[PDB]
Design a protein around this ligand. Structure first.
Ligand code: CU
Ligand code: CU
Ligand code: CU
Ligand code: CU
Ligand code: OH
Ligand code: O
Length: 476
């Protein structure tokens, strides 16, 4: 049988009242011919692409049609705490909440997802995620590929696992609190190994790793290169040619790839060095989508220059903030043990060479920052508004992967896990790798966040976040 076509999220713009309507609700989806309850925005699974423009404001009406509470966060968008949609941005079941977004950042591919306290991993796993396409005056002048769903296509890549009855098999337990929830099935915009018909010339892919815990590494089946033109927070100064592209949970990259007649190829993801993630079939390169060339000319360009990246400032005199990540050693031990018992040596492939004792031994608050599991009633500190700070984030103490994300900003990486960032990671980023080592980022917050609607800073391995590896901070 034929591969299904890649589903394309609708590209959503405001109405005459300058409103965008998002409904959060449950329905059914089909995976390998088996029905499953799933959640989506404006539909049964995943969500639309909200289109925003720099310098214009839009109002979003969000209707929660779930029977549990949720929140809606604009990952990558610089907005005040009150509309950031972190865990304090509760939307009651059957209620509505509206936010006005005053966009003021460069063009970029961002995304949106729930941030329900302690339940973000389950809510994303059940289906909730959407995209944000920000444009500005600079980017249209480049004449990049720009026909949505034809030569400019979003690619949201996510794994899931299912029970025998077909339902999504999500669990936040001792094992997943340590190593993450991951599965054996890969979805691309919700579909299993779809094909995308693309015109001859450049194809623009807006890649999102929407997995809870799985890191990815994109490449092509026939080794054609990817030309990275943008990261989380927008365009790079010039295209960076790569043969492979690691993408951490919650990160976005835009790339251009060449499409030539008569030569279909796959976008694939390569096995990664992360515990648990190389279990078959992820022990081998795994197809993401088939690109099917169409003998119609694509008009997009790959310009020699894209944008101007301002200089890093002098660092002397800037506030230096220390963020020590940690995992309770015993629950790290026990979760890794359960992983190894379940899958055996393969759960460490590619890596380098029972009674109740009460509330303090609970895995639900086992993961921490600066000695504290996330406390919604107590922002850890007050950061400055309109000033560059140096945040130092350490994972020394365990060997798990911690993609660290800071709300309210797009930052510059100074050191990524002990090394200067790769060139395609040297621009605007909202995530930095932390794994057994130390990262440092230069951050600036342009909007206020009060204690009642604080910004979060956290690991984006969702099961770590939900079991405490997050802090709140205020700005202004
Ligand atoms: Cu975010
Ligand atoms: Cu996020
Ligand atoms: Cu983590
Ligand atoms: Cu977040
Ligand atoms: O997040
Ligand atoms: O986020």
């Amino acid at each position: 049988a034929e591969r299904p076509t890649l589903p394309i999220p609708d590209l959503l713009t405001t109405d005459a009242r300058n409103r965008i309507q998002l409904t959060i609700g449950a329905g059914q989806s089909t995976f390998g011919g088996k029905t499953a309850t799933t959640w989506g925005y404006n539909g049964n699974l995943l969500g639309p692409a909200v289109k925003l423009q720099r310098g214009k404001a839009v109002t979003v009406d969000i209707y929660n049609q779930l029977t549990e509470e949720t929140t809606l966060h604009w990952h990558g968008l610089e907005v005040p705490g009150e509309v950031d949609g972190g865990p304090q941005g509760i939307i009651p079941p059957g209620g509505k909440r509206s936010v006005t977004l005053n966009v003021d950042q460069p063009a970029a591919t961002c995304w949106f997802h729930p941030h329900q306290h302690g339940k973000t991993g389950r809510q994303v796993a059940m289906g909730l995620a959407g995209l944000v396409v920000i444009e500005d005056d600079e980017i249209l002048k480049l004449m990049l590929p720009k026909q949505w769903g034809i030569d400019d296509v979003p690619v949201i890549v996510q794994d899931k696992k299912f029970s025998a009855d077909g339902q999504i098999d999500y669990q936040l337990d001792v094992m997943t609190a340590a190593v993450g929830w991951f599965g054996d099935t890969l979805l691309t915009n919700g579909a299993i190994y779809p094909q995308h018909a693309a015109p001859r010339g450049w194809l623009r892919l807006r890649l999102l790793n929407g997995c809870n815990a799985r890191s990815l590494n994109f490449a092509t089946s026939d080794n054609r290169p990817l030309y990275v033109i943008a990261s989380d927070g927008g365009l790079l100064p010039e295209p960076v040619k790569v043969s492979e592209l690691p993408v951490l949970m919650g990160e976005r990259f835009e790339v251009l790839v060449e499409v030539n007649d008569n030569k279909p190829f796959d976008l694939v993801t390569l096995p990664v060095s992360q515990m648990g993630m190389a279990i078959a079939p992820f022990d081998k390169p795994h197809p993401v989508m088939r690109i099917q060339p169409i003998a119609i000319s694509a008009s997009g360009a790959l310009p020699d220059t894209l944008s101007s990246l301002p200089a890093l400032p002098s660092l002397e005199g800037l506030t230096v903030r220390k963020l020590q990540l940690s995992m309770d050693p015993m629950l790290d031990m026990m979760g890794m043990q359960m992983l190894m018992e379940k899958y055996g040596d393969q759960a460490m492939a590619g890596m380098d060479h029972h009674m109740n004792h009460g509330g303090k031994f609970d895995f639900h608050h086992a993961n921490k920052i600066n000695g504290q599991a996330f406390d919604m009633n107590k922002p850890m500190f007050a950061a400055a508004k309109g000033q560059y700070e140096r945040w130092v984030i350490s994972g020394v103490g365990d060997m798990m992967l911690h993609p660290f994300h800071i709300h309210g900003t797009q930052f510059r990486i100074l050191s990524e896990n002990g090394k200067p960032p790769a060139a395609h990671r040297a621009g605007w980023k909202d995530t930095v790798k932390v794994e057994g080592n130390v990262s440092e980022v230069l951050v600036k917050f342009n909007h206020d966040a009060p204690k009642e609607h604080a910004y979060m800073a956290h690991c984006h391995l969702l099961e770590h976040e939900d079991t405490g590896m997050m802090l709140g901070f205020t700005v202004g």
